[model samples]
Target chain A: ENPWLWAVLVLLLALSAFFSASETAITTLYPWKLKELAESKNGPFRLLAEDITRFLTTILVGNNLVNIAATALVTELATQAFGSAGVGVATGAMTFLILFFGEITPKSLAVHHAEAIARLAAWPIYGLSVLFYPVGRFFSLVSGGLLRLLGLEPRL
Target chain B: ENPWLWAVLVLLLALSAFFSASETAITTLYPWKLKELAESKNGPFRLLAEDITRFLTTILVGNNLVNIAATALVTELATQAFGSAGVGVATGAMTFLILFFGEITPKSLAVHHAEAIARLAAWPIYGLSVLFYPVGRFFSLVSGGLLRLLGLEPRL
Candidate 1:
């Protein structure tokens, strides 16, 4: 397993996992916040902003723990099959596996069980969030600006 | 401009928009419903269960919109690109252009206005859902079963 690839995958997967958790959490914890934004006179574009923000926040916070663990596993497995052919198969498999299993699978599950998983992953995700706080905040600012450029009035 | 491709793209985009709406509706409107089946009896597998279930529901609902759009576009573009190199270049360019601008771009905008777009799209998506209802439902069932085997118990 290429340690570098593992690092990258873990980081990416962690972000996605955390984002999924956050997506679930925000919808569960702050539906009114979203609904208010959605129903605002500003129109539905705000809802998109809100969704994106929530997603960013969740991943930022949880990246380290989730990414570290899952990334290690996937990277190790991918690296084991080490020819160029092996690498190609691994990359493709990992991409779909992560996409379907990691992103879509974990996220929807988080939605239904926000309260449950949030209770556990919450601490780890939060700890990582704090660790990545500076970076996360910076991204949030960038994200906010990008949204504004796209015609949205920034609220977060 | 292949109407068939365009039609497929539009249909996929529309369905994607609608599923996003339905997911929001289910998660938002039915909090208690979610809470009820939220594993009162916690255990070693709690977080895994929570995350997995979330992922399953997301894929079950999400893949409908994604696969249709993706497959249609890829198939049509691939078939066209199979001929002469010159035509292939033109065909491929056209394919990417439509996908990036028409399908993805519009979809993102629609997602931003999911609530509003969904209200408009609901009827059409419902119509499509019905037309593809049998296949969709079957996929949902198979996915759900796989989910359960993987430890995600679905409530209806």
Candidate 2:
């Protein structure tokens, strides 16, 4: 295998890891704490906590999109590198790759540094949430509808 | 191509989707609301909301395990069925399958009947959470540790 192909695969894996870590970091943040931070004029934190619906919708969508894209890329790469066997190879490798690097490692880091990570990542995440606001809103409505369907009061 | 193989494939996908949907349903539930329910002498609801940390850890771990297992199963099946093309096909099919059946459909239903679903689903879920308590506690500590590392107070 050429170094170039390997390099591409590594990069893709890293990107996926980043997104996964970010998702964990953001999700683990304390909502009430964020609300307090928001009151203290931490604008980004405010945006994130103020609307749990939009924040969750954006972060989840982003995380899933990255994860899916990464998986697809890995599958294609493994196929090119090892042919039919590559598919199986990729699946095994990726399962470990994602579990250790994409999830456990980064999430561990994030949990330890939850607030700092939240503060540091908040602006960019908030911006992304804003950009995806419409999509988030749509999903919010859908969630509300789902709540209604279940006979629960729609919070969103 | 064979009916047996197809049947196996469908079953795996459905199981995966069920876990996925349960995750969405349980996660979407409001702890506060559950708390309210808990206060009203609802034992199941009380158990669920009373220990948010343990419940979350259990449900999330269970969910992730299923998803990973499902993905691996699909990869293997696609490779066996369609050769090289099967890998790509599996990836694509799984993406849609998880999105619709796993996430959207089940979550939609769960949200509509949040209380009912939560109540009905609570016992098994709570039992699993208890069974997984040690693992959950470890992660909870890790999460709390992460918060401390980040100079934030740990809620759990």
Candidate 3:
């Protein structure tokens, strides 16, 4: 396998793990406060300072983007390798790939090693929130429309 | 159309909503203190007093069970109604059904009425923890195997 094919896959997998672990870490430890000022208000990301919903939305948007990218890449390669059958093959394989690598393993890792990873992920996620705010808001806004279509009220 | 088909679906949908809202409310409000001693440790559910992870696991297990029931029910009905094509139709529709009703709507609702739903759901979820502990542990145990299969270690 060319480094590009396997290489980026590893990178994408790790990024997915990073964000997956990041969300797990952040959500679980919102209760505990870090004495260090870094992730605090005067801290670097200022992510810890923002409300949970925006933080979650930012992660959701980023996670979705990375996941979609992996899918596109996989589909492209599967076509080259196995054509139509490969597409189906790729979809089946990617389900487990993303489920385990993308979520299950990383989240389990976060639970096992909670504190360190949570702090490590905080800053980058914070930055994403600022840069990704408009996009994140669009997600929530669009979700609101879906809620209305389903006969439910949208909330702040 | 038998009311049984539509009726239980509505019930399962609401139950999913209830648990979903409960979780959203609980996690978000973990920071806030409740004035009412009712949901406080002295109150019912005794769920509030437990740690977050176990609390989360209980919900995860119960949520999985209910969602599975819905899937089975849908599959059974889809077979009778449309035979071969219906299972696929059921799967597609169930995806949206569970997404919106089971999680997004309820979670959004919980965010809007965080306090009320959290308190209301505390008792039921807490009760589920006790009754469902054995099954919940099995889930965790099975998850640990999955983690190990992925070459990761699980933790407390």
Candidate 4:
């Protein structure tokens, strides 16, 4: 196990977890509360609350891409490190790690501190959303297609 | 392949697709529209519209279970017939079949004829929901968990 591989793996996992947390925080924050707190002083939170649909779309796309990439890379790394047994070990370990660190803990924290968390996460997420606009647009189209395929008009 | 096995496979696929379509229809139909049309005259549509949340829960539970079972059965049957090749062939075939027959076509029909389809499909779906209440409840709990994890209060 080279130290660099470990570093890469840990970095991916942490970023994945951060995205998951920010996604929860933004969506869960109370819109009315955000509005009450909104003023020139709180621009990022105001923007986040104002354009939730776009942010949600952005985060969903980001979350899925990061999670999938991290999982695939982790699996590959684990296999190289250990052998046939590594796949099984990595699968189990990754599932537990993702369920706990990547999902549960951050989400729980976001649930309680949604307003603050959203304020903190807003700028970077907004930037990411802008940067990933092309990808986000693609996903929005796919999502709309799925909704239409399900017999509903695509609202997004 | 045994004729009985073939018969079972086709039957499962058809039912799976039907459930998929019904799920889409129930979700897409306007609750207000259903309400206006509801009376002693229109039983199924009325019942469905009366409880949107329950119906959504029921359909989601039914959709996932049916889709999983249908895919598993198809994979198994295909595997028995074609060895390892069965997995790949079944994956490819099922993807196309499910997307086309199970999702797009039926959903399109549901969208155009929501009232009629909802009326016709209502009774059987209602029964399935009742029969699967325990499973549905479990899924509802899981759904709530996911919602909370996403930083949203679980409404359903």
Estimated TM-score per prediction? 0.38, 0.62, 0.54, 0.51
At residue A12, candidate 4 shows an lDDT of: 64
Better of 1 and 4 by DockQ: 4
Tens-digit lDDT track of model 1 for B35-151: 443454332123223333343344334443353233334333443445323223433443333333333344334434533442343344444444344543454465456666777
DockQ of each: 0.04, 0.18, 0.09, 0.07
Question: lDDT scores for all predictions?
Answer: 0.45, 0.62, 0.63, 0.62
Per-residue lDDT tens digits of candidate 4, residues A64-113? 44544444445454545665445455555655455555655566557767
Candidate 2 ranges with C-alpha deviation above 4 Å: A1-13, A24-58, A65-100, A111-156, B24-29, B39-42, B130-156
Candidate 2 local lDDT, A101-142, one digit each (tens):
566556766765666667776666567776665664665566
Ranking by DockQ: 2, 3, 4, 1
Q: Tens digits of per-residue lDDT for model 3 on A1-156?
A: 477777887787788778888888776666545334335554433445456667776776566456545554554455456644554555555544665677656776787665677668777777888866566575456667777776656533
- Candidate 1, residues A1-156: lDDT per residue as tens digits? 457855665566656666665556555645555555446545432433444444445463443234223422343344344522333444345435444545555655665665455445544544554545555455445544655577843344
* Residue-level lDDT tens digits of model 3 in B1-156: 588778987898788778777778777766445434335555533446445556665676566445545544554455456754554555556655666567666777677666677667776777788866555565446657777776656333
Question: Per-prediction TM-score, chain A only?
Answer: 0.50, 0.73, 0.81, 0.83
TM-score: the better of candidates 1 and 2: 2
Clashing pairs in 1: A1-A79, A61-A129, A105-B55, A106-B55, A108-B54, A109-B53, A109-B54, A109-B55, A110-B54
Candidate 4 docking quality: incorrect, acceptable, medium or high: incorrect
Q: Write the per-residue lDDT of candidate 2 for residues B1-156, one digit (tens) a residue.
A: 568855765675565555555555556666667768889875777877777666666665665544444555565556656775765676667655655555655666665567776677667777777666676466556655665676555444
Most accurate candidate by DockQ:
2
Task: Show how many residue pairs clash in every candidate, following the order shown.
Answer: 9, 5, 0, 0
Query: Which 10-residue window in model 3 chain B sums to the lowest lDDT?
Result: B31-40
User: Whole-model lDDT, candidate 1?
Assistant: 0.45
Could you arrange the candidates by TM-score from highest to lowest?
2, 3, 4, 1
Q: Best by TM-score, which number?
A: 2
